[PDB]
Design a protein around this motif. Structure first.
Motif, PDB file in Angstrom:
ATOM      1  N   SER A 185       0.848  -1.193   0.000  1.00  0.00           N
ATOM      2  CA  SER A 185       0.000   0.000   0.000  1.00  0.00           C
ATOM      3  C   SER A 185       0.879   1.237   0.000  1.00  0.00           C
ATOM      4  CB  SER A 185      -0.931   0.077   1.215  1.00  0.00           C
ATOM      5  OG  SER A 185      -1.703   1.263   1.197  1.00  0.00           O
ATOM      6  N   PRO A 186       0.437   2.339  -0.598  1.00  0.00           N
ATOM      7  CA  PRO A 186       1.136   3.617  -0.395  1.00  0.00           C
ATOM      8  C   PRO A 186       1.064   4.091   1.050  1.00  0.00           C
ATOM      9  CG  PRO A 186      -0.200   3.684  -2.374  1.00  0.00           C
ATOM     10  CD  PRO A 186      -0.582   2.430  -1.654  1.00  0.00           C
ATOM     11  N   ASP A 187       0.039   3.636   1.779  1.00  0.00           N
ATOM     12  CA  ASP A 187       0.017   3.802   3.228  1.00  0.00           C
ATOM     13  C   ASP A 187       1.187   3.081   3.882  1.00  0.00           C
ATOM     14  OD1 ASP A 187      -2.323   5.308   3.130  1.00  0.00           O
ATOM     15  OD2 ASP A 187      -3.610   3.544   3.340  1.00  0.00           O
ATOM     16  N   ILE A 188       1.464   1.853   3.446  1.00  0.00           N
ATOM     17  CA  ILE A 188       2.405   0.999   4.166  1.00  0.00           C
ATOM     18  C   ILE A 188       3.840   1.431   3.903  1.00  0.00           C
ATOM     19  CG2 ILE A 188       3.222  -1.360   4.445  1.00  0.00           C
ATOM     20  CD1 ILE A 188       0.571  -0.801   5.728  1.00  0.00           C
ATOM     21  N   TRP A 189       4.184   1.664   2.629  1.00  0.00           N
ATOM     22  CA  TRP A 189       5.538   2.045   2.224  1.00  0.00           C
ATOM     23  C   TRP A 189       5.994   3.347   2.868  1.00  0.00           C
ATOM     24  CZ3 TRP A 189       8.910  -1.015  -0.269  1.00  0.00           C
ATOM     25  CH2 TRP A 189       8.402  -2.130  -0.939  1.00  0.00           C
ATOM     26  N   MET A 190       5.053   4.255   3.118  1.00  0.00           N
ATOM     27  CA  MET A 190       5.320   5.353   4.037  1.00  0.00           C
ATOM     28  C   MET A 190       5.527   4.832   5.453  1.00  0.00           C
ATOM     29  SD  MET A 190       2.699   8.332   2.756  1.00  0.00           S
ATOM     30  CE  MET A 190       2.788   9.037   1.113  1.00  0.00           C
ATOM     31  N   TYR A 191       4.582   4.031   5.947  1.00  0.00           N
ATOM     32  CA  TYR A 191       4.563   3.704   7.368  1.00  0.00           C
ATOM     33  C   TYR A 191       5.631   2.688   7.741  1.00  0.00           C
ATOM     34  CZ  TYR A 191       0.131   6.227   7.826  1.00  0.00           C
ATOM     35  OH  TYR A 191      -0.844   7.199   7.841  1.00  0.00           O
TER      36      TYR A 191
ATOM     37  N   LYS B 177     -14.545   0.077  -2.842  1.00  0.00           N
ATOM     38  CA  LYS B 177     -13.192  -0.236  -2.389  1.00  0.00           C
ATOM     39  C   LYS B 177     -13.100  -1.764  -2.278  1.00  0.00           C
ATOM     40  CE  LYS B 177     -10.913   2.831  -1.813  1.00  0.00           C
ATOM     41  NZ  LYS B 177      -9.990   3.475  -2.786  1.00  0.00           N
TER      42      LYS B 177
ATOM     43  N   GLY C 198      -2.932  -3.696   3.819  1.00  0.00           N
ATOM     44  CA  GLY C 198      -2.578  -2.456   4.486  1.00  0.00           C
ATOM     45  C   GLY C 198      -2.689  -2.556   5.993  1.00  0.00           C
TER      46      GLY C 198
END
Ligand SMILES: *[C@@H]1O[C@H](CO)[C@@H](O)[C@H](O)[C@H]1NC(C)=O
Ligand SMILES: *[C@@H]1O[C@H](CO)[C@@H](O)[C@H](O)[C@H]1NC(C)=O
Ligand SMILES: *[C@@H]1O[C@H](CO)[C@@H](O)[C@H](O)[C@H]1NC(C)=O
Ligand SMILES: *[C@@H]1O[C@H](CO)[C@@H](O)[C@H](O)[C@H]1NC(C)=O
Ligand SMILES: N[C@@H](CCC(=O)O)C(=O)O
Ligand SMILES: N[C@@H](CCC(=O)O)C(=O)O
Ligand SMILES: N[C@@H](CCC(=O)O)C(=O)O
Lengths: 58, 48, 240, 192, 96, 192
Positions: free
Chosen positions: B32-38, F186, F192
């Motif tokens: 996720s783009p969430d994860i690669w940040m986080y 979604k 995630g």
């Protein structure tokens, strides 16, 4: 054996091709031994003799 | 009739051409783009 | 071979005591038992400690390190598929292999039409069936058809049924399979006595009902039992 | 690049003798020989003894790790995908399975017993199998057994032949299986 | 180069080791799950698999030699194709 | 940093490594399992899908438009699901759409019905929506006894009531458009 087995040839070829360079390492430093004191052939024996001395394993 | 001057059969008229090339980050897409940040947030934090 | 190259290469033995000067004792870390460990230590994606110094020794390491990388990720890759595809079989297939083990005890009706097949069997596998059918005559040879059906569900017992009787026992019991091939091949001749006057009268009547296929229009619905939703949608299994 | 950065890095050209405070006469660990065995060791994910200490060099191999981390994993994933779907390959196991596959044609020996049998089959699958044989009737139903041996061996074709010859086909060509068994059982007889 | 000594510093790295076990492993998993369903993805070429998916609006022209082939069809796929074409109406069964 | 040196330290760790090499490669392979069978699931949004996976308890009304349609459908998957409804009974057919709404909302039940009601089902009670597509096209007209002299009278009356456009005027007066801001866009991918 059919599925991957060509890598065993690629395995063995590494064991083949390493022979060419390992003997390449011996004679080239023997040349440096034959540059300083020895001639060409009395160089290549005298470190090979003390390879048989082999600095006892255990 | 007489003769088949233009003999033939039946096929299907269609295309669906919508996919051409991803190109862009797509190896990024599994997490996720969430994860690669986080996940990089954590490594920056834990190294302190 | 790692020990082979290490005892012929000169670009090799390097003196310890770096902090101290020349110190002409000569040492390299390679022995067989060391190379017994570095190859395994490469094989487990670990690395012992040792970094081979000659490029010739690095051919020995790197090709093995490449052979390391090929095998291990290939192991993970297939091991997904067994979990994923899950080609499940309780197989044992033919006449031969099913006679190699006796947990698949051959259910057949005593004094049966199956028995008469196994009694005068001339095929070598089927002839050797008769060796141990009569041996465990008590257990491996059932008393009736319904008797043999019940044993299969309870035990790992295996009972012999006709193809269209197979058809409905799998249909009435949806979690029950046929295993193997089409061993016997005969027919259901309608029974009249010897020298009967009732042969040709019953014979043409069958042929008159097979004309429209009355026997099959009867067959399609009497062999239409429960639902049996043949295969079911699975889900991934945490490893046990 | 590792060698070239190690020619021009400030925290490179550090001393040898890490235990001796003296003997400064420079150490140049990352050679062009050593940088070979470095990156390949990360490319095989084993690593060499020589790690970057110079911060210039530490950005090099660290992102070079992120090369190899992806590629080896991506090598695994398509291999895990390729070996999945070939196991997901389940061929035809019935004539009913094959009565629908219009892309997989089927006829017989022309005017043989099957050409009679499927035509008079009041069995719903094999009835419709005759209909498919009825439709492409010019292409399907070749002249003899050999021609139907031939076109299975040159195309996608099913050739509803007979078991006593099928049990001869595997005796010569084990390219050719027996999907399903024995639609109808019959007997060879001599015709007076 | 450095491993921790000093159990305090050990455990921090070891759990940080435990985290990067998972994320490297988890990434490899769902990447396959993409690349498996891509091979599961099949662009339809037969009329056969096209006969079962009514998700495409497909049909033919009314009163056509194409049409009446489906209309007199007795064929497994082409039956199911002509099953819905008369059944929907000219909405999908065009005149041109 | 630690090193086995003698054999007793060696033979443990390497087999401990062989213990190790299994588990992570086990774990990656089995975490791959719990993702593919998420992605090979089915947002079943067609009647053909909803027929085959016998999960969604799917029923209808008995004595309605839908029952008679699938009783008289010449479409195989619809004949297939009618054979489910043939094998089933009042069990899934329950009746009278209010009996259908309750089993959909409380259980895994799927309810065969028609557009404008299922439309108005989407409008209130934001848990239920139209799953799939419009199969056919019937129309709400007025029932008329055979050969009665009212049919042509009311047809002019309804059409001039549509020349008013009153149908779509009192549409929103009797559908009241509603809330439920679509609620579902979604859950495709991306852990995630
Ligand atoms: C394919 O691309 C065209 C042009 O962008 C688009 O109009 C159409 O909706 C696409 N098809 C899809 C998304 O199924
Ligand atoms: C399979 O399980 C059934 C009961 O669940 C049992 O009767 C049968 O013997 C088992 N088969 C084996 C262990 O091969
Ligand atoms: C068929 O089998 C023969 C021998 O069994 C073999 O020589 C031939 O290559 C095979 N044909 C194909 C297409 O594999
Ligand atoms: C139906 O929706 C309402 C509000 O959206 C919610 O409170 C209720 O729990 C839902 N019913 C369920 C989930 O069964
Ligand atoms: N043996 C068949 C011909 C081949 C076939 O129909 O399979 C016959 O007697 O006609
Ligand atoms: N050739 C067709 C018209 C084209 C078509 O129907 O595909 C005919 O004569 O009816
Ligand atoms: N409008 C339907 C009744 C309601 C229904 O069956 O859903 C009919 O004419 O039969």
């Amino acid at each position: 054996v059919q599925n991957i087995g060509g890598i065993f040839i690629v395995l063995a070829a590494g064991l083949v091709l390493s022979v060419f360079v390992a003997v390449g390492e011996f004679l080239y430093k023997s040349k440096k031994n034959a540059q300083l004191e020895k001639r060409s052939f009395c160089s290549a024996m005298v470190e090979e003799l003390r390879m048989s001395l082999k600095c006892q394993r255990r | 009739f007489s003769k088949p001057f233009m003999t033939l059969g039946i096929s299907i008229l269609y295309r669906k051409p919508n996919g051409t090339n991803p190109g862009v980050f797509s190896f990024l897409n599994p997490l996720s783009p969430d994860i690669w940040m986080y996940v990089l947030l954590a490594c920056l934090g834990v190294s302190c | 071979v790692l020990f082979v190259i290490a005892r012929f290469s000169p670009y090799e033995w390097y003196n310890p005591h770096p902090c101290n000067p020349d110190s002409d004792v000569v040492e390299n870390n390679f022995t067989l038992l060391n190379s017994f460990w570095f190859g395994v230590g490469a094989l487990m994606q670990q690395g012992s400690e040792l970094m081979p110094k000659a490029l010739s020794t690095r051919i020995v390491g790197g090709i093995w390190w490449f052979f390391t990388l090929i095998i291990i990720s290939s192991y993970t890759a297939n091991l997904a598929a067994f979990l994923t595809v899950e080609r499940m079989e309780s197989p044992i297939d033919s006449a031969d292999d099913l006679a190699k083990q006796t947990k698949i005890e051959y259910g057949a009706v005593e004094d049966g039409a199956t028995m008469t097949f196994f009694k005068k069997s001339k095929i070598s596998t089927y002839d050797k069936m008769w060796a141990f059918m009569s041996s465990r005559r008590q257990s491996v040879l059932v008393k009736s058809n319904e008797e043999g059906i019940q044993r299969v569900l309870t035990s790992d017992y295996a009972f012999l049924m006709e193809s269209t009787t197979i058809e409905f026992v799998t249909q009435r019991n949806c979690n029950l399979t046929q295993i193997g091939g089409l061993i016997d091949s005969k027919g259901y001749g309608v029974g009249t006595p010897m020298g009967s006057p009732y042969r040709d009268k019953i014979t043409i009547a069958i042929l008159q009902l097979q004309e429209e296929g009355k026997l099959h229009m009867m067959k399609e619905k009497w062999w239409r039992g429960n639902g049996c939703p043949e295969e079911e949608s699975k889900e991934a299994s945490a490893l046990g």
